Please model this.
Amino acid sequence: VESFASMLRHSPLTQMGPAKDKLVIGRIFHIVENDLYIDFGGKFHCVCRRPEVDGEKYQKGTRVRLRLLDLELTSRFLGATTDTTVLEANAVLLGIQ
Amino acid sequence: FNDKILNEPLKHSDFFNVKELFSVRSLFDARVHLGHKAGCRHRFMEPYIFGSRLDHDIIDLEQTATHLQLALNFTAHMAYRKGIILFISRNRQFSYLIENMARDCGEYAHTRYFRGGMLTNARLLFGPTVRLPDLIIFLHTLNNIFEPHVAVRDAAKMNIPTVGIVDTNCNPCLITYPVPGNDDSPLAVHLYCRLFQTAITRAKEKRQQVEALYRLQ
Amino acid sequence: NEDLPISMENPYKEPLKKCILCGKHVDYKNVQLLSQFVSPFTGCIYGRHITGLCGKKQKEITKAIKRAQIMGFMPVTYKDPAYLKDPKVCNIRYRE
Amino acid sequence: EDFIKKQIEEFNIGKRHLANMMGEDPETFTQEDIDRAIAYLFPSGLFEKRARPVMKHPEQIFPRQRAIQWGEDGRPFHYLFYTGKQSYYSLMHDVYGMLLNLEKHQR
Amino acid sequence: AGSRLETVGSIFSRTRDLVRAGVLKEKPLWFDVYDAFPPLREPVFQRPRVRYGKAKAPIQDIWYHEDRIRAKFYSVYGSGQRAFDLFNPNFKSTCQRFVEKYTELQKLGETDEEKLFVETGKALLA
Amino acid sequence: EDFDTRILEVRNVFTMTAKEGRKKSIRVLVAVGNGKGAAGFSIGKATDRMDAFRKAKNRAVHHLHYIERYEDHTIFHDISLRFKRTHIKMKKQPKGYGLRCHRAIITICRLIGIKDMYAKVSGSINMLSLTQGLFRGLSRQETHQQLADKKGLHVVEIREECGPLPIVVASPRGPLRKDPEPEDEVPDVKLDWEDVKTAQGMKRSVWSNLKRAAT
Ligand SMILES: [Zn+2]
Ligand SMILES: [Zn+2]
Model:
């Protein structure tokens, strides 16, 4: 039986290291107008605008490639005791496949 | 003598074999270990957090496994003894899933705006002789302003046991069976719905089996 | 036990950001660099939010500017017109 | 309710008694003829058309009393009972579901 | 009756004390299930508090040895066009290839880090 | 039906309205108890005193506590508690000592079943802090079995009435610890100057040990 420490060490979100500028495949799972709600693994989903070029090749299930800038996107402000999470990650859609 | 269909499961440990529905691998692939950042933590969730990876906290999945065993055992026993299990959430991305899960089982779901006094001014709000739930299971303990849900306090005020998935930014304080785990990922929430639905359905079918056996006996 | 984590100081730690003049010697005779951190129209010494200098360097540039202008090296009310052509390093935007 | 049931019985019997005193003792006394018969029987002379007398089936007279939402087990019938707005939230859940499965397919 | 004092103890403690006194005549449905299988911590109210002086959280940072070389890899040879999948377990990225080959030579028997790096660099070049 | 409700404070409470002006509202505090441990207090507010009384008692029965008693007559130990700015100092006392407490504490302890205890209140005597601090301390007593379980040792009694005879009151329900308790010579405990004054006989009051009626 594998221990949770083993599960973690040999895992791909623990071999990714710092999320910034790491290319990642994701799957569109919801579309509102032109906001594509994609995944990429991770705890949160990213939301990206519809790329107008090839702008019908982005449907529910399409595998896309994302740059990834953040995995949770949060910040503390003036009087706050905790962080203001947007419950969403931050990525830039490069294209398909 | 019906104190053998209401006392027997209570001396068999794991009377419903609920230990074979979840493993630390099943949870890891459901992404239960992934938590929030050190900046959205809670002092009372600190005992359940394995550590922090790249300022992103992770939850100890062995502790999640033990807590989930205890939680699913309790849920199975209340569903067997024919309680009322109310599933409460305020997600908005999983409301459809929780109400459909209640309807596929036979339990109940509050996924909408909790009106003040639902469990507390209950006789005036519903009717003089209402049976309040005998177990409230929160799939997401926080409301939409990222604060603890009124029901967690009012369930305790009204002495209703509570099972709840507590993420890193949550207060595992007034929750009888807290289950340290991710509730922000569709795979995690889907696995929780699947596990609770399976427990409740197996519990009710086993209750029918023992009632049939004693009726024939 | 072998895959439990280990106490170490943070890898992937980016080296601290350094100022444009970190390691260089500011001098009052260097009215070409001092003029860069002044305003073309009024001669106003720029702040940290425009220059992007560390505290040590904003202090040395301010003191060298004041020394040179009272010593007869720098104009006070304008940027010597000969230097409205050098590399701009200040985050300000007058024209539109 | 037993109230509703005996009110019904009493309307039916009183409607037949109404056609006797008039002259339409044949069984089919319509609601328009009922309004006609009570108008004459007891002259109104009141400006409010609700303040005048009336003889309808108890159905329209008495309001809609909602049924009991739980049997003798507790155990409320609808799954969305503890919202307190079962019908509205069931309708909203259904409409959201038809929008969802329609998006999966596609006064 | 019941005790709506959510802050004094737990629901178990309140219910046990009241059925001992004799004011809760029937026990609730969940009491015997609690008494059979209690949680690992009784749900008693605790007020959250801000750490003020020299008090720090016990939570540690997860750092493995391979990360010393992982950080070095990205530094020299940046993140390649071979993109991370993340959706599939057992994904072996190019940096994982690098650490595995590097750790190989390490086990075999080598010493200075720079020599280790150039040897595994030529190994991945092959 | 086994529950007795007794008032503790009635106050005529006023607020100002734009149209009416001074608007009276009766604010009452009542305490309910069956002399077996279950007791609790609550505030009722109304425009009519009967309505305030009804609200207060019917709310306190839903907000009861449970007070543990030594031999159903006294408290387990000595309780010193400052609630806000009210200091309540209570001492466990032997049987037949009576309720030598503040009159509100006497009524509350008759509703709880405590028959013999000493109590002195100082600071601000606010009734709605007195009852709350009293219930806080009495519901946060530590019993003999809990002390035995926490320390792993026998909890035994030494009365001067019986003699040198040891009377075991609470033994641990688990294992027995075998390292003896550390005899910390010259203990670091915060003493009360009133207690030390009474011990040394320099507490001269013409009000202290006065012959009063029963309880
Ligand atoms: Zn969360
Ligand atoms: Zn510098």
In short: Residues 1-217 of chain B form one domain. Residues 39 and 81 of chain B are 42 Å apart (CA to CA).
